[PDB]
Amino acid sequence: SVPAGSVSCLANALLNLRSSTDYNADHGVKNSILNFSNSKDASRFDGSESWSSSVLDKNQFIVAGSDSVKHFVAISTQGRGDHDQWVTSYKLRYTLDNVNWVEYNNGEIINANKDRNSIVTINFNPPIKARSIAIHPQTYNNHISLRWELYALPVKSYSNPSVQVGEVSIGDRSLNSGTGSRTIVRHVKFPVEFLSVPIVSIGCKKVDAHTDNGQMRWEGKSENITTKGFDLTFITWGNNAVYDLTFDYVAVEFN
């Protein structure tokens, strides 16, 4: 079973494909998408409804890859739509760093197809975590020919952040006197405008302040965050005299 919500990688043209060999360009990996089907006009040939290797041995493969870390949850294979050709068993190989390749599950040989069109699906628990994956047919019927699809987790909503950083201080004696709940606002303009409204984290890196009968009171808050900047509100209360406070900030936009 293909888990609900998963991404069809070839359907969405998310992976580059490279076969070991092709019978010819009209039998190439571009024709390997699961359920691939073309013209039924038998007078002209518009391509095999599969990838088909040229060499017939145990060393053929399609490699599927891209820069990003995919979490593959399953793989589906299928035979050739237009001729009695199919892969009947295959091994999997993969790589997360693109330098070291590993055998999936110690070189597990997986039972594949029995006919032209029936879909056989394999599920990975836990997901294979890879940048490139390769299918390696071991046995076949008539010829090494397949359609297939790879399934991956969708991308997390938090992914691909943009970040801007900086520091901000009171800079003067605004909170160094008076009584009660006291506030002073520093307006921060981000060096560059965000696309979406960031979330902002702050951290104190300087405290110069007087206790009030032994009590220390200071707070920093970010507020009125927009795409262009925000307000760092420096806060004190009781009778505390804050001479200076400094925060670093980290602003993060996603999605």
> Contact positions toward Ca ion, by CB under 5 A?
38-39, 46
Q: Which two tokens stand for residue 97?
A: 């760093």
Which 8-state DSSP code applies to residue 24? -
Q: How far apart are CA 14 and CA 8, in angstroms?
A: 9
Q: How far apart are CA 114 and CA 110, in angstroms?
A: 13
Q: What is the size of the binding site for Cl ion (CB under 5 A)?
A: 1
- With contact defined as beta carbons under 8 Å apart, do 228 and 245 qualify? no
Question: Please, which residue, 111 or 179, has the CB nearer to a second copy?
Answer: 179
**38 carries a ligand binding annotation:** yes
- With contact defined as beta carbons under 8 Å apart, do 173 and 248 qualify? no
**39 carries a ligand binding annotation:** yes
**208 carries a ligand binding annotation:** yes
Sole binder of a second copy in the list 3, 11, 139, 142 (CB under 8 A) = 11
Sole binder of Zn ion in the list 16, 38, 59, 68 (CB under 5 A) = 68
Q: Residue number with the shortest CB distance to Cl ion?
A: 207
**C-alpha 1, offset from chain centre:** 22
- Cis peptide leading into residue 126 (ω within 30°): yes
User: Which of Ca ion, Zn ion, Cl ion, none lies near 39, with the C-beta cut-off 5 to 8 A by kind?
Assistant: Ca ion
- With contact defined as beta carbons under 8 Å apart, do 44 and 102 qualify? no
Question: Please, which residue, 71 or 83, has the CB nearer to a second copy?
Answer: 71
The residue whose two tokens read 């979330």 is 199
User: Which of Cl ion, Zn ion, a second copy, none lies near 221, with the C-beta cut-off 5 to 8 A by kind?
Assistant: a second copy
Examine residue 185 and tell whether it contacts Cl ion (CB under 5 A). no
128-157 residues in contact with a second copy (CB under 8 A) are 129, 131-132, 153-157
Question: Please, which residue, 24 or 114, has the CB nearer to a second copy?
Answer: 24
Interstrand relation of 102-103 and 162-169 (parallel, antiparallel or unpaired): unpaired
For the CB of residue 127, give the shortest distance to Ca ion in the complex, in Å. Answer: 35
User: Which of a second copy, Ca ion, Zn ion, none lies near 180, with the C-beta cut-off 5 to 8 A by kind?
Assistant: none
For the CB of residue 22, give the shortest distance to a second copy in the complex, in Å. Answer: 6
Q: How far apart are CA 138 and CA 58, in angstroms?
A: 5
48-67 residues in contact with Zn ion (CB under 5 A) are 67
**C-alpha 189, offset from chain centre:** 31
Distances (CA, A) of 179 to 7, 41, 90, 130: 59, 89, 77, 60
Sole binder of Cl ion in the list 207, 210, 226, 255 (CB under 5 A) = 207
Distances (CA, A) of 254 to 69, 160, 188: 18, 7, 20
81-89, 114-122, 142-150, 246-254 -> range binding a second copy (CB under 8 A): 246-254
Binding residues: 38-39, 46, 208, 217, 237
Binding residues for a carbohydrate: 208, 217, 237
Binding residues for Ca(2+): 38-39, 46
